[PDB]
């Protein structure tokens, strides 16, 4: 398996996929807007009640939503 690679570890590949999705989506979120918690979750720092969201995919989908946009323009 050294000379030509054999097989693939689909669980670790899925871990890598989660990292690459995270890096991609994170580069479009400015550093003030998102606060990363101790366990790897994310809070929205715009919205006054700080909702906490499990992934960066959910944080991006939140930042699309109308509650966030209304809370955004006040800040």
């Amino acid at each position: 398996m050294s000379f030509k690679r054999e097989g693939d570890d689909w669980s670790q590949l899925n871990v890598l996929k989660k990292r690459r999705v995270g890096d991609l989506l994170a580069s479009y979120i400015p550093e003030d807007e998102a606060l990363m918690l101790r366990d790897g979750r994310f809070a929205c720092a715009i919205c006054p009640h700080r909702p906490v969201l499990d992934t960066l995919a959910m944080l991006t989908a939140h930042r699309a939503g109308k509650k966030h946009l209304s809370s955004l323009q006040l800040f």
Binding site: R5, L13, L16, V52
Partner: protein, 216 residues
């Protein structure tokens, strides 16, 4: 049909425990009797709060867990930190290639050091006595409140030989109204006669302090 708080408070043997809603109880006499019994711990305070327990904005910024000291003495944290700092640089090719040609003896701490961490350097942590229930703000409101007649070393800022500078004026302005029973030297406390401190000396001479039944 039901008591108001004043009748209930007089009917208790001890009226400091009664709250607004205890009158709404189906048996309020027994409830305030049980709240004033010794060594019982009160109902957790968030039973009436609308927000869920520990789901609060201050809890967002909690820092990571810290290891105890006797474990950081092993050097586990520096080794494993370096290790996972290399492993984010590797590609999937390289990781799957060292899974067919492994690398022995990498992250090894000698057994004697690990045994000593657990069987020699272990220290008991700070523990809490019974009835000290955790609530949500607790670890920030843990500063408490130090009484007049007891000074801190730092309050060094005064730099005065040992009585208090303010007292030279408390005798002038009077004893403060807020404290009815406070006692300070020169006003109503001996610097009459001063035999109070001699009592503590004589008693302290009297005592044997040898704990019975300890290890030799």
């Amino acid at each position: 049909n039901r008591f108001t708080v004043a009748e209930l408070k007089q009917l208790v043997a001890r009226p400091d425990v009664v709250e607004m809603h205890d009158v709404t109880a189906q048996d309020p006499k027994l409830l305030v009797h049980l709240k004033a019994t010794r060594n019982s711990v009160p109902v957790p305070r968030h039973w009436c709060f609308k927000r869920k327990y520990l789901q609060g904005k201050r809890g967002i910024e909690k820092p990571p867990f810290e290891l105890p000291d006797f474990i950081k003495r092993t050097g586990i944290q520096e080794m494993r930190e370096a290790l996972q700092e290399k492993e984010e640089q590797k590609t999937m090719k390289s990781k799957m290639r060292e899974k067919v040609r492994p690398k022995m003896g990498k992250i090894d701490i000698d057994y004697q050091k690990l045994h000593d961490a657990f069987f020699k350097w272990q220290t008991k942590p700070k523990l809490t006595i019974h009835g000290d229930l955790y609530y949500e703000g607790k670890e920030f409101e843990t500063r408490l409140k130090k009484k007049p007649g007891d000074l801190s070393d730092e309050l060094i800022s005064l730099g005065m030989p040992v009585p208090p500078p303010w007292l030279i004026a408390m005798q002038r302005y009077g004893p403060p109204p807020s404290y009815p029973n406070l006692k300070i030297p020169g006003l109503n406390s001996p610097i009459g006669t001063n035999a109070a401190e001699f009592q503590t000396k004589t008693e302290e001479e009297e005592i044997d302090r040898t704990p019975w039944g300890e290890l030799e």
